[PDB]
């Protein structure tokens, strides 16, 4: 491979004209507009690019060595927290190690298993999603048992599809390799099509469930777009023709919907969302003992877009809600619906400097809360009177989630972090006062010893003076003496927190090469609440990029990493982050760049699939004042001819409907046009398996792709196997 | 945040009933 040998890429004469508040009419050539399309010319181009990328990777014998190490690092048994259904049995997911989809197991006995005996010794298969299609073309993307434990609803996607289909089966009818060989599927004839972008919410009478669906579309009808969502109700044992439309809004075709049902059967809740801002409406209906019927009466409790409201529970007409209303770090309020003018009060007040991330009601009257303080989760138990009783797992450092059912006398915590593979803790209210908290299961990994790795948090300063924390992970033999390479990962938007997580592949890379992993908590994320998001959003989105570039500069200046040896990686918004960072940062700031499925055409993102929802994140290119801050940031529109680019390996999936791949296609074509003689390769990989909505790749392909990515980075930074 | 890069089995039973 050598510079200047990129595929022949036609440049059209297409020009789009935008309105700028400061400059008036702005003509913007789009010579690669044709890469938005699906044609034989595009297929020739993608094939040529993918062949070039693979030819380059074929030169690197270390990639196969990394595949071997990475596959081994993933080859350990994995499991979820178990859930106790109303049949008395416990159900949990189990992966033997390298299965592409984990398998839902049910306890042999109606008692909590001793999991030290082994999953197959204490449980039998209930639902194996790998058998949904013999060829692996179908995946289970979401599931939900009914409250009575009698039924299991499950959403299935297929390769090539843009929606999921919900099926229902009795909990007494397993789906396994044995059951398929021995008889018919076992499911009911119910087939609930066109499901997308909501949860499955059973009514507490177990008669049916709420789900969001879209209009049916014939193959050649319409465009690839999801509009005119409907919140619907499906009664078990019926066809979809009988489903009830609970809510839709023809006046606002872009809005989407969610629902919840109170444990006591009294209330149905409707949430409405207009964009990706964390603002929502909240309406409340009273259900009578007959449950959901047509013609529901909504009380419009929250009827303007101003804040995030999510129901926790209710006691009678007193509804407990997690909200950021006048509280950017979140809090719990009560809204008392027995009043005509609801009374609103703080139950758990906002903490100025810790985000309230999750609250669940447990054992009927208690509350379990997770606070994210300095991007590290803390777990607390609260009484019915709102008294903080105790901190649970006080020495845990990482990310935590709660799993429970309110009526039950236990809850679980799932705990993980950079060196914590996955611990499931149990709190049992029936146990003696000092014996209530225990460890149910700890994930045991393969080859790696998590104790060999350390994570710390350091603080650096961005351009504008803001102090930003950053996690640094290392194998403990690695010194911060200005010699290590660094992989710096980010997302940087949508109030998504860049939380600790366990990755055996990353740890294997760190140990193999003596490298460090860096995760800066840049603005645009949610780590410090709404104000942190607002600090990198719309007109302040540039701050996200400044924060990410400053992190890389800090790693080198302060001797965590060697000059030229910071590589960057991110996906979706994180791919935008990577692509904009390499355009904007001083030459030589980065040694390698891997944007995955990234946004890059910030002038047209709102014209494809669900991109209009991101106007709350990026601004609206059609508004002149907003064009003026978008255009200078858009990576496709800011490539220069005079800056050396780091080695770059862009990766996309051809079927991606979240971020259409034209973003990356235009970006790579623009790079290759502007700096064809760049000294470092500028390459793109294009996976041509068209994943259905919500579907993942097979494990073997994920391992192969990880080896290509991390091997590319290692070679670009000059790292050798030692 | 980590959909493709991290196995999600650990959290997959957090909200199934």
XYZ file of C-alpha atoms in Angstrom:
739
model
C 0.000 0.000 0.000
C 1.116 3.549 -0.779
C -0.287 7.091 -0.762
C -2.247 8.324 -3.789
C -3.918 5.073 -4.815
C -7.468 5.597 -3.708
C -10.468 4.455 -5.724
C -11.690 6.587 -8.598
C -14.578 8.603 -7.156
C -16.738 10.745 -9.408
C -17.335 14.362 -8.360
C -20.721 15.624 -9.394
C -21.638 19.233 -10.037
C -24.355 19.221 -7.315
C -24.598 22.421 -5.271
C -26.936 23.140 -2.384
C -27.606 26.719 -1.319
C -28.071 27.555 2.360
C -29.052 30.751 4.136
C -26.548 32.185 6.648
C -27.506 34.928 9.056
C -24.060 36.522 8.793
C -23.259 35.847 5.100
C -26.600 35.543 3.301
C -26.685 32.938 0.518
C -23.979 30.279 0.835
C -23.480 27.834 -2.064
C -22.161 24.512 -0.773
C -20.900 22.064 -3.421
C -21.822 18.442 -2.621
C -19.816 16.506 -5.232
C -20.436 13.254 -3.350
C -24.224 13.646 -3.084
C -24.437 10.487 -5.203
C -22.975 8.441 -2.311
C -26.306 8.956 -0.544
C -27.823 6.488 -2.995
C -27.895 2.779 -3.638
C -26.712 2.062 -7.176
C -24.307 -0.096 -9.111
C -21.784 2.810 -9.120
C -21.992 3.038 -5.318
C -21.536 -0.750 -5.045
C -18.385 -0.557 -7.182
C -17.055 2.209 -4.959
C -17.835 0.489 -1.669
C -16.345 -2.764 -2.973
C -13.190 -0.935 -4.097
C -12.849 0.788 -0.715
C -13.489 -2.371 1.301
C -10.987 -4.323 -0.824
C -8.351 -1.599 -0.281
C -8.917 -1.613 3.450
C -8.723 -5.402 3.666
C -5.622 -5.462 1.451
C -3.944 -3.038 3.880
C -4.951 -5.049 6.945
C -3.670 -8.241 5.225
C -0.145 -6.763 5.444
C -0.310 -6.836 9.281
C 0.334 -10.348 10.662
C -0.315 -9.119 14.185
C -4.071 -8.843 13.520
C -4.474 -12.639 13.569
C -2.480 -12.773 16.814
C -4.859 -10.235 18.333
C -7.893 -12.183 17.104
C -6.612 -15.240 18.986
C -6.020 -13.216 22.168
C -9.357 -11.367 21.922
C -11.451 -14.472 21.277
C -9.902 -16.071 24.355
C -10.568 -12.953 26.413
C -14.295 -13.155 25.524
C -14.563 -16.913 26.151
C -16.073 -16.985 29.628
C -19.583 -17.712 30.890
C -21.861 -14.676 31.233
C -25.169 -14.260 33.032
C -27.783 -11.713 34.039
C -29.534 -11.015 37.292
C -32.408 -13.515 37.791
C -36.073 -12.451 37.943
C -38.668 -14.190 40.124
C -41.948 -14.609 38.243
C -45.344 -15.209 39.813
C -45.020 -18.920 38.948
C -42.420 -19.139 41.738
C -39.549 -19.786 39.337
C -36.509 -17.689 38.560
C -35.426 -16.774 35.037
C -32.096 -15.414 33.840
C -29.955 -15.092 30.713
C -26.901 -17.295 30.285
C -24.187 -17.285 27.580
C -21.763 -20.208 27.460
C -19.093 -17.699 26.365
C -19.154 -16.968 22.629
C -22.828 -17.377 21.711
C -24.218 -14.659 19.514
C -27.387 -14.425 21.606
C -27.698 -15.337 25.258
C -30.291 -17.911 26.306
C -33.135 -17.429 28.779
C -33.100 -20.113 31.491
C -35.744 -21.107 34.100
C -34.983 -22.600 37.437
C -35.718 -26.281 37.859
C -37.078 -25.608 41.349
C -39.312 -22.729 42.617
C -36.480 -21.411 44.770
C -33.518 -19.095 44.266
C -30.716 -21.253 42.817
C -27.294 -21.789 44.296
C -25.597 -20.614 41.120
C -22.254 -22.082 42.208
C -23.697 -25.410 41.055
C -23.754 -24.244 37.434
C -26.469 -22.769 35.243
C -27.292 -26.085 33.485
C -27.488 -27.889 36.787
C -29.952 -25.423 38.337
C -31.955 -24.390 35.243
C -33.352 -25.558 31.947
C -33.686 -23.595 28.696
C -36.885 -21.583 28.433
C -36.190 -19.391 25.400
C -33.204 -19.747 23.066
C -33.300 -16.841 20.588
C -30.649 -18.519 18.471
C -33.310 -20.906 17.170
C -35.645 -18.158 15.948
C -34.007 -18.812 12.554
C -31.747 -21.765 11.724
C -29.465 -19.453 9.718
C -29.060 -16.847 12.464
C -30.993 -14.279 10.471
C -33.409 -13.478 13.391
C -32.644 -11.890 16.715
C -34.629 -11.183 19.828
C -34.276 -7.506 20.520
C -36.550 -7.019 23.557
C -38.712 -9.157 25.843
C -41.131 -8.881 28.740
C -42.947 -11.439 30.891
C -46.494 -10.720 31.967
C -47.009 -9.735 35.612
C -48.782 -13.041 36.332
C -45.892 -15.024 34.896
C -48.103 -16.854 32.385
C -46.920 -15.234 29.149
C -43.699 -14.085 27.533
C -43.779 -11.360 24.889
C -40.738 -11.086 22.648
C -39.742 -8.748 19.835
C -37.981 -10.265 16.828
C -35.996 -8.552 14.081
C -34.688 -10.112 10.865
C -31.836 -9.189 8.575
C -33.066 -6.573 6.148
C -35.922 -5.309 8.325
C -36.622 -1.837 9.727
C -39.217 -2.835 12.400
C -39.667 -5.650 14.897
C -42.545 -8.094 15.394
C -43.819 -9.048 18.840
C -44.818 -12.649 19.487
C -46.329 -14.181 22.618
C -45.880 -17.606 24.130
C -46.882 -19.386 27.305
C -44.157 -19.553 29.936
C -44.852 -23.305 30.013
C -43.889 -23.652 26.306
C -40.109 -23.467 25.853
C -38.402 -22.523 22.595
C -35.249 -24.630 22.333
C -33.403 -26.756 19.818
C -35.192 -29.763 21.322
C -38.647 -28.227 21.207
C -38.312 -27.125 17.573
C -37.106 -30.587 16.517
C -39.876 -32.328 18.453
C -42.915 -30.247 17.548
C -44.395 -26.950 16.493
C -43.075 -23.636 17.776
C -45.536 -23.398 20.695
C -46.266 -19.706 20.433
C -49.731 -18.208 20.072
C -50.808 -17.012 16.618
C -50.529 -13.384 17.828
C -48.230 -11.389 15.534
C -47.798 -7.736 16.444
C -45.977 -6.043 13.540
C -44.458 -2.603 13.018
C -43.075 -2.260 16.553
C -40.280 0.231 17.131
C -38.871 2.762 19.634
C -40.729 1.810 22.816
C -40.751 -0.740 25.601
C -43.356 -3.506 25.980
C -45.646 -2.579 28.910
C -48.091 -5.145 30.253
C -51.232 -4.160 32.021
C -51.248 -5.456 35.583
C -54.197 -7.736 34.809
C -51.872 -9.583 32.359
C -54.476 -9.369 29.618
C -52.306 -7.508 27.140
C -49.559 -5.014 26.602
C -48.888 -1.583 25.256
C -46.376 -1.065 22.442
C -45.505 1.658 19.937
C -46.009 0.927 16.291
C -45.835 2.650 12.960
C -48.026 2.603 9.853
C -47.788 -0.531 7.770
C -45.831 0.065 4.592
C -45.745 -2.044 1.474
C -42.292 -2.700 -0.016
C -42.285 0.192 -2.524
C -44.395 2.586 -0.448
C -42.990 5.644 1.278
C -39.463 6.362 2.315
C -37.250 4.951 4.993
C -38.748 6.968 7.771
C -40.697 6.429 10.917
C -43.595 8.858 11.249
C -47.096 8.859 12.701
C -46.291 6.609 15.647
C -49.183 5.115 17.557
C -49.226 3.850 21.117
C -51.327 0.710 20.934
C -52.662 -2.071 23.126
C -52.585 -5.753 22.161
C -54.844 -8.264 23.933
C -53.249 -11.701 24.303
C -54.892 -14.304 22.100
C -56.011 -11.928 19.349
C -54.682 -10.784 16.001
C -53.317 -7.265 15.568
C -56.495 -6.222 13.730
C -58.142 -6.052 17.176
C -55.452 -3.856 18.781
C -56.596 -0.561 20.319
C -54.946 2.770 19.451
C -54.357 4.289 22.917
C -52.816 7.484 21.537
C -51.607 9.129 18.335
C -51.194 12.724 17.170
C -51.645 13.404 13.466
C -50.772 17.092 14.044
C -47.265 16.183 15.270
C -46.166 13.219 13.139
C -42.595 13.256 14.448
C -43.508 12.838 18.144
C -43.055 9.410 19.759
C -44.661 7.786 22.762
C -43.986 5.673 25.814
C -46.146 4.161 28.533
C -46.160 2.737 32.015
C -48.775 0.990 34.174
C -49.049 1.331 37.930
C -48.596 -1.777 40.083
C -51.993 -1.346 41.720
C -53.854 -1.400 38.366
C -55.178 2.138 38.869
C -53.186 4.227 36.381
C -51.953 4.195 32.829
C -49.269 6.733 32.026
C -48.456 8.227 28.620
C -45.179 9.904 27.832
C -44.652 12.020 24.699
C -41.316 13.015 23.176
C -40.748 15.533 20.375
C -36.936 15.185 19.976
C -33.935 13.739 21.830
C -33.904 16.274 24.433
C -34.843 14.737 27.676
C -38.095 16.651 27.832
C -41.427 14.935 27.857
C -45.112 15.240 28.396
C -46.848 13.077 30.984
C -50.564 12.294 30.888
C -52.413 10.037 33.325
C -55.491 7.888 32.789
C -57.490 6.029 35.403
C -58.091 2.360 34.559
C -61.108 0.560 35.920
C -60.854 -3.118 36.832
C -61.753 -4.095 33.225
C -58.468 -2.523 32.010
C -57.678 -0.836 28.703
C -60.571 -0.014 26.362
C -60.963 2.497 23.544
C -61.709 6.124 24.383
C -59.283 6.608 27.278
C -59.646 9.808 29.278
C -56.242 11.492 29.668
C -55.536 13.945 32.449
C -52.894 16.297 30.992
C -50.730 16.541 34.094
C -47.571 17.699 32.280
C -48.667 19.370 29.052
C -45.692 21.484 27.943
C -42.174 20.387 27.024
C -39.902 21.624 29.810
C -38.417 18.726 31.775
C -37.870 14.960 32.021
C -40.539 13.077 33.995
C -40.421 9.326 34.608
C -42.790 7.515 36.970
C -41.334 5.525 39.889
C -44.538 4.352 41.585
C -47.698 5.558 43.299
C -49.370 5.071 46.660
C -53.010 5.824 46.033
C -53.267 9.153 44.244
C -49.734 10.220 45.306
C -47.463 9.635 42.299
C -43.675 9.506 42.797
C -41.693 10.795 39.820
C -38.032 11.154 38.938
C -37.637 14.560 37.302
C -35.198 17.295 36.360
C -37.868 20.044 36.703
C -35.950 22.995 38.112
C -33.302 20.406 39.054
C -30.613 19.684 36.490
C -29.113 16.893 38.639
C -32.577 15.277 39.022
C -34.726 14.636 42.106
C -37.859 12.767 43.187
C -41.124 14.655 43.419
C -44.629 13.640 44.366
C -47.689 14.846 42.398
C -50.892 14.369 44.400
C -53.695 13.709 41.919
C -56.473 13.800 44.525
C -56.443 17.597 44.016
C -57.898 19.373 40.977
C -54.726 21.445 40.891
C -52.170 18.759 41.639
C -49.919 19.472 44.586
C -46.171 19.055 43.753
C -43.522 18.481 46.467
C -39.923 17.289 46.694
C -39.634 13.813 48.226
C -35.884 13.298 47.712
C -34.351 16.735 47.017
C -31.872 17.461 44.255
C -28.210 17.024 45.120
C -26.267 19.965 43.707
C -23.295 17.805 42.792
C -24.552 14.282 42.169
C -26.979 13.123 39.496
C -29.896 10.979 40.570
C -29.658 8.294 37.870
C -32.251 5.683 38.880
C -34.895 5.145 41.596
C -36.906 1.938 42.088
C -39.534 1.184 44.699
C -38.748 -2.069 46.501
C -40.559 -4.212 49.046
C -43.695 -2.105 48.533
C -42.576 0.977 50.479
C -38.789 1.441 50.220
C -36.803 3.193 47.529
C -33.414 2.211 46.078
C -31.512 5.119 44.495
C -28.379 5.285 42.364
C -26.466 8.555 42.437
C -23.744 9.227 39.918
C -21.111 11.328 41.722
C -17.964 12.174 39.753
C -19.181 9.657 37.129
C -19.128 6.809 39.643
C -22.307 5.209 40.929
C -23.377 5.028 44.577
C -26.334 2.973 45.833
C -28.628 3.991 48.716
C -31.695 2.552 50.445
C -34.423 5.004 51.506
C -37.440 4.498 53.720
C -41.034 5.363 52.947
C -40.445 8.625 54.862
C -37.638 9.578 52.513
C -34.877 8.885 55.015
C -31.589 7.710 53.567
C -30.975 4.544 55.584
C -27.742 3.111 54.306
C -25.245 3.027 51.466
C -25.026 -0.392 49.783
C -21.754 -1.722 48.314
C -19.881 1.322 49.612
C -16.487 0.217 48.240
C -17.734 -0.471 44.711
C -16.261 1.753 41.980
C -18.068 1.675 38.672
C -21.546 1.664 37.168
C -24.602 0.167 38.874
C -28.209 -0.678 37.999
C -31.185 -1.898 40.057
C -33.373 -4.852 39.091
C -36.495 -5.695 41.042
C -40.255 -6.054 41.249
C -41.867 -3.666 43.728
C -44.100 -6.218 45.433
C -41.241 -8.597 46.250
C -39.067 -8.737 49.347
C -35.709 -8.539 47.516
C -33.906 -6.536 44.900
C -30.719 -6.973 42.896
C -27.872 -4.712 41.851
C -25.811 -5.306 38.730
C -22.306 -3.873 39.196
C -19.517 -3.512 36.648
C -16.598 -1.280 35.813
C -13.232 -1.108 34.165
C -11.865 -3.956 36.311
C -15.165 -5.444 37.601
C -16.517 -7.982 35.076
C -20.048 -8.262 36.475
C -21.213 -8.754 40.016
C -24.845 -9.428 40.956
C -25.684 -8.405 44.527
C -28.877 -9.257 46.403
C -30.695 -7.399 49.152
C -33.162 -9.595 51.081
C -35.549 -7.687 53.371
C -36.572 -10.953 55.090
C -33.048 -11.633 56.427
C -31.666 -10.504 59.795
C -30.781 -6.809 59.866
C -27.010 -7.259 59.378
C -27.297 -10.113 56.848
C -29.512 -8.542 54.191
C -26.875 -7.736 51.569
C -24.990 -10.510 49.781
C -23.219 -11.353 46.538
C -25.295 -13.713 44.398
C -22.811 -14.226 41.558
C -19.471 -12.892 40.363
C -18.439 -13.166 36.701
C -15.197 -15.143 36.285
C -13.200 -14.173 33.208
C -10.668 -16.074 31.047
C -6.875 -15.597 30.984
C -7.118 -12.020 32.252
C -6.886 -11.251 35.945
C -8.906 -8.104 36.580
C -6.768 -7.371 39.646
C -3.869 -6.649 37.267
C -5.605 -3.459 36.098
C -6.104 -0.098 37.739
C -8.473 2.710 36.953
C -8.052 6.229 38.275
C -9.744 9.533 37.585
C -7.747 12.644 36.751
C -8.882 16.200 35.987
C -7.769 18.403 33.098
C -8.710 21.868 31.852
C -10.479 22.617 28.608
C -9.874 25.673 26.417
C -12.423 27.781 28.302
C -11.114 26.807 31.727
C -13.704 24.137 32.571
C -12.314 21.270 34.616
C -13.151 17.888 33.074
C -12.597 14.472 34.726
C -11.147 11.577 32.791
C -10.799 7.885 33.619
C -7.391 6.340 32.906
C -7.104 2.540 32.819
C -3.805 0.630 32.738
C -2.259 -2.708 33.345
C -0.439 -2.048 36.622
C 3.013 -2.725 35.121
C 2.596 0.259 32.811
C 4.262 3.501 33.920
C 3.118 7.073 33.238
C 6.535 8.128 31.988
C 5.672 9.447 28.572
C 6.103 6.122 26.718
C 2.671 4.366 26.617
C 0.208 4.579 23.773
C -3.324 5.640 24.628
C -6.718 4.749 23.226
C -9.071 7.615 23.997
C -12.771 6.863 23.713
C -15.713 9.216 23.624
C -19.346 9.751 22.752
C -20.034 13.363 23.710
C -23.710 14.075 23.330
C -27.358 13.442 24.084
C -26.872 13.524 27.872
C -25.338 10.023 27.577
C -22.799 9.448 30.345
C -19.442 7.905 29.448
C -19.708 5.466 32.363
C -17.228 2.774 33.503
C -17.692 -0.550 31.740
C -15.891 -3.890 31.489
C -14.263 -4.860 28.185
C -11.969 -7.919 28.156
C -10.758 -6.970 24.688
C -9.656 -3.504 25.807
C -7.895 -4.928 28.870
C -6.170 -7.508 26.680
C -4.924 -4.737 24.400
C -3.652 -2.764 27.386
C -1.732 -5.737 28.732
C -0.411 -6.814 25.334
C 1.004 -3.434 24.428
C 1.462 -1.602 27.734
C -1.092 0.956 26.525
C -3.610 3.010 28.499
C -7.370 3.568 27.961
C -8.706 7.077 28.535
C -12.369 8.099 28.890
C -12.845 11.868 29.297
C -16.226 12.992 30.608
C -16.644 15.666 27.937
C -19.499 18.152 27.801
C -22.525 17.076 25.844
C -22.671 13.974 28.004
C -24.924 13.587 30.999
C -22.299 12.972 33.642
C -23.011 16.214 35.540
C -26.668 16.579 34.681
C -28.538 18.799 32.280
C -26.032 21.614 32.529
C -23.239 19.285 31.352
C -25.316 18.348 28.315
C -26.206 21.986 27.636
C -22.488 22.782 27.749
C -21.979 20.787 24.585
C -25.160 21.101 22.560
C -26.438 23.203 19.648
C -24.538 26.499 19.744
C -22.075 25.123 22.344
C -21.402 21.814 20.533
C -17.881 23.045 19.721
C -17.110 22.610 23.439
C -17.438 18.828 23.100
C -14.659 18.850 20.511
C -12.499 21.266 22.518
C -12.900 19.028 25.591
C -11.913 15.898 23.645
C -8.910 17.518 21.984
C -7.746 18.987 25.308
C -7.891 15.512 26.866
C -5.497 14.143 24.235
C -3.174 17.109 24.656
C -3.207 16.588 28.443
C -2.320 12.889 28.153
C 0.853 13.809 26.291
C 1.746 16.986 28.229
C 1.455 15.205 31.572
C 3.312 12.054 30.449
C 0.485 9.555 30.560
C 1.063 8.892 26.864
C 3.896 9.333 24.411
C 3.828 12.120 21.796
C 1.967 11.011 18.680
C 0.566 7.909 20.352
C -3.006 8.908 21.290
C -5.562 7.080 19.143
C -9.239 7.991 19.230
C -12.371 5.892 18.839
C -16.131 6.429 19.108
C -19.385 5.365 17.530
C -22.463 7.240 16.243
C -22.206 10.662 17.910
C -18.774 9.370 18.981
C -17.895 8.869 15.304
C -18.816 12.478 14.629
C -16.616 13.329 17.593
C -13.687 11.451 16.037
C -14.152 12.851 12.511
C -14.508 16.435 13.706
C -11.606 16.069 16.109
C -9.169 15.002 13.385
C -10.262 17.947 11.213
C -9.988 20.471 14.047
C -7.038 19.468 16.206
C -3.495 20.606 15.488
C -1.569 18.330 13.136
C -0.055 15.437 15.093
C -2.468 15.567 18.029
C -3.642 12.043 17.205
C -1.753 9.009 15.960
C -4.792 7.065 14.744
C -8.527 7.478 14.395
C -11.383 4.927 14.213
C -14.851 6.534 13.767
C -17.631 3.904 13.756
C -21.013 4.609 12.160
C -20.501 8.319 12.658
C -22.464 11.401 11.699
C -20.345 13.668 9.459
C -22.607 15.685 7.124
C -24.046 18.105 9.679
C -25.806 20.107 6.938
C -28.022 17.189 5.821
C -28.297 14.877 8.860
C -31.944 15.872 9.403
C -32.943 14.701 5.898
C -32.300 10.962 6.522
C -34.179 8.366 8.622
C -34.554 9.698 12.181
C -32.020 12.511 11.986
C -34.607 15.259 12.485
C -34.742 14.241 16.163
C -31.124 15.393 16.511
C -31.932 19.048 15.808
C -32.168 19.373 19.602
C -28.506 18.246 19.695
C -26.899 19.933 16.664
C -29.216 22.757 15.597
C -31.239 23.101 12.410
C -29.179 23.715 9.223
C -32.207 25.382 7.608
C -32.320 28.149 10.255
C -29.827 30.877 9.253
C -28.588 31.619 12.773
C -28.027 27.915 13.406
C -26.399 27.213 10.034
C -23.793 29.743 11.148
C -22.557 27.599 14.057
C -23.185 24.231 12.332
C -21.337 24.843 9.076
C -17.906 25.512 10.664
C -18.203 22.290 12.691
C -19.506 19.887 10.012
C -16.633 17.471 9.270
C -17.574 16.887 5.618
C -17.402 20.660 5.044
C -14.151 21.505 6.856
C -11.497 19.203 5.353
C -8.364 21.115 4.307
C -5.600 20.346 1.835
C -2.677 21.394 4.056
C -2.932 19.240 7.229
C -1.515 15.729 7.624
C -4.281 13.381 8.837
C -3.611 10.491 11.221
C -4.041 6.950 10.002
C -7.814 6.542 9.866
C -9.960 3.398 9.610
C -13.653 4.289 9.297
C -16.134 1.476 9.843
C -19.802 1.295 8.894
C -22.634 -1.226 8.534
C -24.449 -0.896 5.208
C -27.910 -1.294 6.726
C -27.506 1.241 9.498
C -30.785 3.142 9.824
C -29.792 5.123 12.876
C -26.850 6.839 11.163
C -27.002 6.243 7.450
C -23.559 5.318 6.050
C -23.516 8.166 3.494
C -22.108 10.296 6.323
C -18.919 8.241 6.480
C -18.887 7.734 2.684
C -18.862 11.475 2.033
C -16.262 12.053 4.722
C -13.805 9.430 3.420
C -14.295 10.529 -0.197
C -13.593 14.118 0.854
C -10.469 13.126 2.785
C -9.164 11.077 -0.135
C -9.818 13.953 -2.535
C -8.203 16.642 -0.390
C -5.066 14.802 0.856
C -4.608 11.922 -1.586
C -0.890 11.812 -0.827
C -1.429 11.699 2.909
C 1.404 9.646 4.464
C -0.999 7.585 6.574
C -3.773 5.452 5.129
C -7.312 6.826 5.049
C -9.498 3.720 4.744
C -13.104 2.523 5.193
C -14.563 -0.900 6.005
C -18.167 -1.553 4.968
C -19.998 -4.552 6.403
C -22.541 -5.557 3.732
C -24.726 -7.738 5.966
C -27.884 -5.675 6.385
C -28.640 -5.910 10.076
C -32.276 -5.659 11.024
C -33.253 -3.001 13.488
C -31.777 -3.727 16.882
C -29.716 -6.670 15.712
C -26.107 -7.328 16.466
C -23.430 -9.156 14.552
C -22.375 -12.737 15.277
C -19.695 -13.045 17.947
C -17.091 -14.380 15.528
C -17.472 -11.330 13.291
C -17.329 -8.976 16.307
C -14.005 -10.603 17.311
C -12.612 -10.325 13.800
C -13.658 -6.684 13.553
C -12.131 -5.902 16.969
C -8.825 -7.421 15.897
C -8.837 -5.339 12.693
C -9.606 -2.121 14.597
C -7.136 -2.527 17.445
C -4.502 -4.036 15.152
C -4.850 -1.080 12.808
C -4.373 1.278 15.715
C -1.387 -0.674 17.062
C 0.432 -0.650 13.722
C -0.342 3.021 13.127
C 1.211 3.847 16.535
C 4.216 1.603 15.851
C 3.429 -0.879 18.623
C 4.923 -4.334 18.505
C 3.980 -7.605 20.096
C 6.476 -8.257 22.888
C -22.875 3.982 25.008
C -21.236 0.535 24.555
C -23.813 -1.428 22.465
C -21.434 -3.122 19.982
C -18.231 -3.225 22.057
C -19.465 -4.666 25.397
C -21.401 -7.882 25.956
C -24.799 -6.874 27.348
C -25.783 -10.148 29.055
C -25.066 -8.764 32.544
C -27.805 -6.121 32.345
C -30.203 -8.098 30.128
C -32.304 -9.339 33.025
C -32.777 -5.999 34.705
C -36.223 -5.206 33.254
C -37.910 -8.372 31.946
C -41.022 -8.329 34.225
